[PDB]
Amino acid sequence: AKYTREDIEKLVKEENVKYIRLQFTDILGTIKNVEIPVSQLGKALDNKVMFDGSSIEGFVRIEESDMYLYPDLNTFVIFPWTAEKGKVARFICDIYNPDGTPFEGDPRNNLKRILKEMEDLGFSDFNLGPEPEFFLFKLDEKGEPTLELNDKGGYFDLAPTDLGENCRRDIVLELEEMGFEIEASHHEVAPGQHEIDFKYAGAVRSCDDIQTFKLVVKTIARKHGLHATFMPKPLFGVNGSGMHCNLSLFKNGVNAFFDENADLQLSETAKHFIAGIVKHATSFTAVTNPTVNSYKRLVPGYEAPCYVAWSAQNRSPLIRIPASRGISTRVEVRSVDPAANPYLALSVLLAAGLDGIKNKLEAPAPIDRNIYVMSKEERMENGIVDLPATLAEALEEFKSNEVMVKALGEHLFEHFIEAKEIEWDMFRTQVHPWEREQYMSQY
Amino acid sequence: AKYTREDIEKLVKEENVKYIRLQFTDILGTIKNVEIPVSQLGKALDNKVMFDGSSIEGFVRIEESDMYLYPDLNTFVIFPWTAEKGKVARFICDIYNPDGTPFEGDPRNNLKRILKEMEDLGFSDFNLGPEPEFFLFKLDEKGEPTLELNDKGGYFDLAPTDLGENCRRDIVLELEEMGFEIEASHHEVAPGQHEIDFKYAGAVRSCDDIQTFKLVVKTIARKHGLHATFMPKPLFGVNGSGMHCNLSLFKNGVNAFFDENADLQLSETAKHFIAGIVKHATSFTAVTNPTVNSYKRLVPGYEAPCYVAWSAQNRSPLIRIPASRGISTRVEVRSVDPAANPYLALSVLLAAGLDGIKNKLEAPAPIDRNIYVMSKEERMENGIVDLPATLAEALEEFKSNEVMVKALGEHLFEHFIEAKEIEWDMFRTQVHPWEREQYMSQY
Amino acid sequence: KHGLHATFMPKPLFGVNGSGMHCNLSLFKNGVNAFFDENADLQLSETAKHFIAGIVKHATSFTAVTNPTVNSYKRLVPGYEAPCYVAWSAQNRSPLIRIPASRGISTRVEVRSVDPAANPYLALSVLLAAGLDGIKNKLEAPAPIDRNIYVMSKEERMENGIVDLPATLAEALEEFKSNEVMVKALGEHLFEHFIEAKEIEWDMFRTQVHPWEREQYMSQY
Ligand SMILES: [Mg+2]
Ligand SMILES: [Mg+2]
Ligand SMILES: [Mg+2]
Ligand SMILES: [Mg+2]
Ligand SMILES: [Mg+2]
C-alpha cells in the first residue's frame, strides 16, 4: 500500500484539498467521475458514496441502478495546476454492487479478473509500457477546435522551441509534479503530433496512468489555447496516432521473456506469448481499435500495422520486439490506438497471450522482408492474414473468438457489442460530403 | 428498321443539322461521345470513324487502342433545344474492333449477347419499363451545385405550379418532341425529387432512352438554373432515388408472364423468373447499385429494398408485381437505382431471370406481412436474406456467383471489379467530417 | 460571473434531455425512519407502502404544482428519462416513483416528476399532503410495475394500473381543480391566485403563433 487511510486524511488537510473527484472509466473508455466536497471525504473513504452505475455502459444505458464507489487510496493524486481558492484531488475507484460484490460490467474489474488468470498460471506481474500519441490543434475565437496544427515539426524534431508555449514540455512537467515517472517525449512524424512514453508499470497501474494522462494532456493543452486529441486518424493523408503497447510477463520477479542462451535471447514462454497474440490479433482488434475512425489509421503507408506478423526490424510489424533485452525483454503490439479502452485492451491482450502460454501454441516465423510490396495473394502463400478493415468486420471476428469474448465478461461483452453496433450503423447510414463531391455531378 | 441510310441523309439536309454526336456508354454507365461536323456524316454512316476505345473502361484505362464506331440509324435523334446557328443530332453507336468484330468490353454489346441467350431459349422480346427518379438543386452565383432543393412538394403533389420554370414539365415536353413516348410524371416523396416513367420498350431500346433521358434531364435542368442528379442518395435523412425496373418476357409476341387460369394470373414461366432474381439478387446488387453511395439508399425507412423478397403489396419489396395483368403482366425489381449502368443492369437481371426459367428454379412464398418489424434472427427463420450493406460486400458476393459473373463477360467483369475496387478503397481510406465531429472531442 | 447563464427551465432545447428536480422523500416517527422495515417485502414498512399509495392516487392531480410552467410538459415526454406514467418501481427506464437501493435511515421514496421550475414550498405541500392522505386513509398501494411501460400500447397500458400524466398545463390544471385534498393542500388564498396565474399564463401560450406553425403551414396551405 502506497497510502494508508491516515496518510490520505493528513494529505487532504495539509494540502488544503477542497475538491475531491472520484473518477472511473466507462465501457467506451471515457473518463467518468463523481465530484464531492472535501467535507465528504469521510463517506468516501468508507466506500459509502453511491452513484448511478448504469453510467458505466455509456450511451447504451437503459435504467438507472444504484451502485457503490470504492476509492483506491493508492491512486490518490493532487492536480498541481488547480490551486488557491481550492485544491483538487482525485481517487480512481472501483465499482461495487449494492450487496458488496464487484460489478461485472466495470472494465477495471475485468482487467483484475484476467490478471487473476495470469497469477493462477504462475506469473507474478504483467507490465505495460504505453506510447500514446496525440495531435494538438488551435482554438478559434469561440474556443472551438480547428484543423490548424500547433506546429510544423517532423519526427523527433525540436518541436515548439522553448517559448512560453511548448505544450508538450509543460505537460511532462505537470505529470512529473503529480508523481508521473515519464521515460521520454518527442515530436512525432506528422505536424502537430506528439508522443510521451512512460516507464513500464503493472497492468492496472499503467492503465490508470493512461487514463489520467489523457485527462492531463487534454486539460493542460486547453490552457495553452490548444486542443489535444487521441483520435486515431484526425486528418486524412497524414499519419494517424497509435498507442503501442510494450508488454512483458514476470515470474517470481523475473522477466519470463528473456533467455540469454536462446536465439534472439527469447525464452519459450515469450515465443508462445507471440503465438497467442498472432492467433487472436484479428479478433481483439475491435477492442484495441474500438472506433470507426480507428480503421482509417489501419491503412498502409503510415507506419501502422495492417497485417498480423512480427519481427525485430520492419516497416511496421503488428508485433515488434525492441532491441534491449534482459529485464527489459518485451513484446510490443503496435495495432492498439489511444482511443482504445486501456483496461479492456489489456484484458484482451493478456488473454490472447496467456492463451498461447497455456496451450503451448507454436509461434510463426518472423517476417523481416518488406511485406507492403506483396499482393493479397502473395500474402496468403506466406500465411499472412490481414487485420479487419472496418469496425463492422472487427466485430464479426471478435464475436467468433470464444477466448476473446470470454476475456471481457458476458456483461461487458454484451454492452460493448451493442454500443459499437449502433456506432457503425450511424456511420454507414450517413451521407458524407465525399460521396457528394464524387457522385453529385458525375451521376 | 426505323431509318434507312437515305432517310438520315435527307433528314440531316432538310433539318440543317450542323453537328453530329456519336454517343455511347462506358463501363461506369457514363454517357460518352465523339462529335463530328455535319461534313463528316459520310465517313460516319460508313462506320469508318475511329476513336480511342480504351475510353470505355473509364478511369481504369491503361493504353489507348484504336476502335471503330458503328452508328445505329434507328437511334437518330435531333435535340430540339439546340437551333439556329447549328442544329445538333446524335447517333448511339456500337463499338467494333479494328478487324470488324464487336468489342467484348462494350456494355451495349453485352446486353445483346444476353438477349441472344434469351432468344435461344424461345423468347421473342424482353421489355423494360423504367421509373428513374432524380433531384433538382439550385445553382449559386458561380453556377455551382447547392444543397438547396428546387421546391417543397410531396409525393404526387402539384409540384412547381405552372410558371415559367416547372423544370419537370419542360423536360417531358422536350422529350415528346424528340420522339420520347412518356407514360407519366409526378413529384416524388422527398422535396425537390421528381419522377418520369416511360412506356415499356425492348431491352436495348429502353436502355438507350435511359441514357438519353439522363442527358436531356441534366441538360434542360441546367437551362432552368437548376442542377439535376441521379445520385442514389444525395441527402441523408431524406428519400433516396431508385430506378425501378418493370420487366416482362415475351414469347411469340405474348406476355409469357400472364396465365389467367393460374392464381394471381401468373404463369409458371413468370414464377420461375422470380426465383431467378431471388437467387441472384444479392449477387447482382454490385451492378444495379454500382456506387458507394448507392448503399446509403439501401437502408430501412425510405421505401427502398433491403431484403430479398417479393409480394403484390408491401412496404417496399425487392420484387413487386403490379396490379394490371394480361399484356401488362410484369415483374418489378425495385433495388436498381439510376446510377446503375442501364445496359449492364439489364444484362445481369435478364441472366438471373433466364437462369430460373432454364433450371426451373422454384419461387419462394410471397411476403405480404410487414418485414421491417422483424429482427435479423426472426428474418432467418423465414428465409429472408439481406442485401449487401456496402459496395465491398456486394463485390464479394458478385464474384461468388458464376452466372452473374458470366452475365457480363470476362473483359467487362475484370474492369468493373477493378474500378469499383478502387472506388471503395478511396472511400474507406477517407476521413469524413462525421468521424471528426464524433471523435475529435470525445477522444 | 463565469460569463455563463444558468437555467432551470424544464426543457430549453427540443430533442435534448430536460431538467428535473427529483425529490427523495422520507418520513420520520420519533426520530426514526418510518419507511424502513427489516423483515418486510422489499424491506418497506406499511407506512411506506401507504405513502406510495397516496402519491399514486394524486399524482395526476399535483402535477400542475410540481410542473407549474407550460414548458414543464415538453419535458414530460417519453425518451428522456422523465416520468410519463403513474407507477412506482426500483429498477426501470423512468418511473414516476422510485425506491433507491439503500435502506436503513436512508429508506426513501423518490418522486421524479418534479422539475426545478416548481415552487419548492408548494411542491412539498401537495406531495406531503398526498402522502399523508394515503397513510391516514391507509390506501392500498398498487403492484410495483417493473417491466417496461415505454413499449406498451396505450390501451394495454391502461388495462393495467397505469395512467399517463397530464399532457399540457391545461390538462394538469383541470385535474388539480377536481382534487379536493390537493386543493385544500395549498390554501384558499394560494390556490386562487395560482390557478389565475397559470390560466392567464396558458392562455398567452395558446393564442400565440409559433415559427413552427408557419414553417409547417405557411407553404403547405
Ligand atoms: Mg510512436
Ligand atoms: Mg513504438
Ligand atoms: Mg417512384
Ligand atoms: Mg415503383
Ligand atoms: Mg434520480
From Swiss-Prot, chain C:
Binding site for ATP: S26, R93, R98
Disruption phenotype: In cells lacking this gene, expression of glnR, tnrA, nasB, nrgAB, gabP and ure genes is derepressed.
Highest taxon in the source lineage: Bacteria
Induction: Repressed by GlnR under conditions of nitrogen excess. Repressed by TnrA under conditions of nitrogen limitation.
UniProt binding sites for Mg(2+) 1: H22, E110
Documented effect of changing E81A: Highly resistant to Met-Sox inhibition. 8- and 2-fold increase of the affinity for glutamate and ATP, respectively. Strong decrease of the affinity for ammonium
Record note on what altering G79E does: Unable to form stable complex with TnrA. In the presence of glutamine, amtB-lacZ fusion is only 4-fold regulated by TnrA, whereas glnRA-lacZ fusion is derepressed
Protein residues bound to L-glutamate: N17, G18, R75, E81, R93, R112
Boundaries of every GS catalytic domain copy: 1-221
Localization in the cell: Cytoplasm
Function per UniProt: Glutamine synthetase (GS) is an unusual multitasking protein that functions as an enzyme, a transcription coregulator, and a chaperone in ammonium assimilation and in the regulation of genes involved in nitrogen metabolism. It catalyzes the ATP-dependent biosynthesis of glutamine from glutamate and ammonia. Feedback-inhibited GlnA interacts with and regulates the activity of the transcriptional regulator TnrA. During nitrogen limitation, TnrA is in its DNA-binding active state and turns on the transcription of genes required for nitrogen assimilation.
Record family assignment: Belongs to the glutamine synthetase family.
Subunit structure of this chain's protein: Oligomer of 12 subunits arranged in the form of two hexagons. In its feedback-inhibited form, interacts with TnrA in order to block its DNA-binding activity. This inhibitory effect is the highest when both glutamine and AMP are present.
UniProt protein name: Glutamine synthetase
Residues of the full protein shown: 224 to 444 of 444
